[PDB]
């Protein structure tokens, strides 16, 4: 019986969102002096669960996992594996509607998320304002089955209903990848040309991919684009006028807090069974970012006040399901 191992599972190191997510976990392990293990699936749900199992075995269950499930289906099997191993796990973003932490006390510590319908409608509303409320819009979505992809898209469709002057030219999935969004933006410009008066992206990486295509056609900054994540590269694009808005989930914080909750549960520092539901399944507070407050968000992400000890400081409310 040695030290507890802290592990963080996520899709890829190529998306700055996860670069920070990983940084935060790394920083939390650092603070408590526990070994850290990053796990990257690279899009393979099969690899992600395989790795988690391999780790659960080498630690004899003495593990605290903070994972962002590749797909919502993966969440249940991961949670089942941790539960039988006696390990503790926290979920981020993706999970089935029926999967609740309170059904797996105390191993399934918590699920963290944000209201994608609200924020998606927020970035979409800002985008349409920029367009004068009229014009053609193309939209890039995340992995089809992902909960945030579904919610943010739902937020978009709602902003559209409130702006009948906006015409949705075409919605396409780019799986959160800028390299997949690039060629899609190109084909849209060839297909719709001047009809495109704006671009909505389900996350920053895809927006930057969209902006790379615009830049290649000398339109970067002339066609308003929005994203979500609030990643440093996304923030830079906002200060430069190329991205009109984004939403900061604070991946750094997400990465560390997830493990913090899990570790405190394992140490019996918190009484899981007695926590309100909104502390088990939480929608967290995020920061809408635009040029007016971009400088403040940038400064935050270079001098992060790692509030690991204050577990429920950002609980906006419980996760809701339409
Ligand atoms: O797994 C869900 C996450 O996937 C990331 O690629 C994306 O940047 C996040 O905003 C969230 O959608």
Residue nearest atom 12 in ligand 1 by C-alpha distance: 148
C-beta 21 within 6 A of ligand 1: no
**Probe residue for ligand 1, chosen from 74, 116, 207, 229 as the CB with the greatest number of ligand atoms within 8 Å:** 229
Q: Of 93, 152, 151, 149, which is closest to residue 127 (Cα–Cα)?
A: 152
C-beta 142 within 6 A of ligand 1: yes
Q: State the angle between helix axes of 178-192 and 204-216 in degrees (0 to 180), rounded to the nearest 10.
A: 50
The CATH class of the 116-250+285-322 domain is: alpha beta
Task: State the closest ligand 1 atom to the C-alpha of 249, by its place in the atom list counted from 1.
Answer: 10
In CATH terms, are 1-115+251-284 and 116-250+285-322 the same topology? Answer: yes
Residue nearest atom 6 in ligand 1 by C-alpha distance: 176
C-beta 68 within 6 A of ligand 1: yes
Q: Which residues contact 294 (CB under 8 A, 6 or more apart)?
A: 235, 238, 239
Q: Which residues contact 244 (CB under 8 A, 6 or more apart)?
A: 126, 127, 130, 224, 225, 226, 238, 290, 291
**Probe residue for ligand 1, chosen from 142, 143, 209 as the CB with the greatest number of ligand atoms within 8 Å:** 142
Strand partners, 319: none
The answer to whether the peptide bond before residue 93 is cis (omega within 30 degrees of 0) is: no
Method: X-ray
Task: State the closest ligand 1 atom to the C-alpha of 17, by its place in the atom list counted from 1.
Answer: 8
Domain ranges, ordered by start, for the chain? 1-115+251-284, 116-250+285-322
Strand partners, 198: 137
The CATH classification of domain 1-115+251-284, taken from the options 3.40.50.2300, 3.40.50.880, 1.10.3720.10, 3.30.70.1230:
3.40.50.2300
Half-sphere exposure of residue 142: CA atoms within 13 angstroms, side-chain side: 29
C-beta 146 within 6 A of ligand 1: yes
Q: Which residues contact 293 (CB under 8 A, 6 or more apart)?
A: 287
Q: Of 226, 9, 261, which is closest to residue 124 (Cα–Cα)?
A: 226
C-beta 229 within 6 A of ligand 1: yes
16 with 245: CB under 8 angstroms? no
Task: State the closest ligand 1 atom to the C-alpha of 10, by its place in the atom list counted from 1.
Answer: 1
């Amino acid at each position: 019986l040695g030290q507890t191992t802290l592990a963080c599972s996520f899709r890829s190191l190529t998306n700055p969102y996860y670069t920070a997510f990983n940084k935060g976990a790394q920083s939390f392990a650092k603070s408590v002096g526990l070994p850290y293990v990053p796990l990257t699936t690279e899009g393979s749900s099969e690899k992600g669960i395989a790795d988690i199992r391999a780790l659960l075995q080498k630690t004899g269950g003495n593990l605290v996992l903070n994972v962002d499930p590749n797909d919502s289906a993966d969440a249940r099997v991961i949670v089942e594996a941790c539960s039988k191993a006696g390990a503790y796990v926290t979920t981020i973003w993706n999970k089935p509607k029926d999967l609740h932490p309170w059904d797996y006390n105390p191993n399934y510590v918590a699920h963290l998320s944000y209201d994608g319908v609200a924020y998606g409608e927020e970035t979409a509303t800002q985008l349409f304002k920029s367009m004068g409320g009229k014009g053609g819009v193309v939209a890039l979505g995340g992995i089809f089955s992902n909960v945030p992809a579904i919610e943010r898209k739902a937020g978009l469709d709602a902003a559209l209903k409130k702006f009948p002057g906006i015409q949705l030219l075409d919605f396409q999935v780019a799986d959160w990848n800028s390299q997949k969004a690039f060629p899609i933006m190109q084909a849209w410009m060839t297909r719709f040309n001047s009809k495109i008066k704006g671009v909505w992206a389900a996350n920053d990486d895809m927006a930057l991919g969209a902006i790379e295509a615009l830049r290649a056609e000398g339109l970067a900054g002339q066609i308003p684009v929005t994203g979500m994540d609030g990643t440093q590269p996304g923030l830079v694009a906002i200060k430069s006028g190329e991205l009109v808005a984004s939403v900061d989930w604070d991946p750094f914080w997400l990465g560390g807090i997830g493990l913090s909750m899990g570790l405190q549960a394992k140490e019996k520092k918190i009484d899981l069974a007695t926590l309100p539901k909104d502390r088990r399944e939480s929608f967290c507070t995020a920061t809408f970012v635009t040029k007016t407050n971009v400088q403040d968000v940038i400064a935050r992400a270079a001098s992060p006040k790692a509030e690991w000890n204050n577990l429920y400081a950002r609980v906006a409310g419980p996760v809701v399901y339409r």
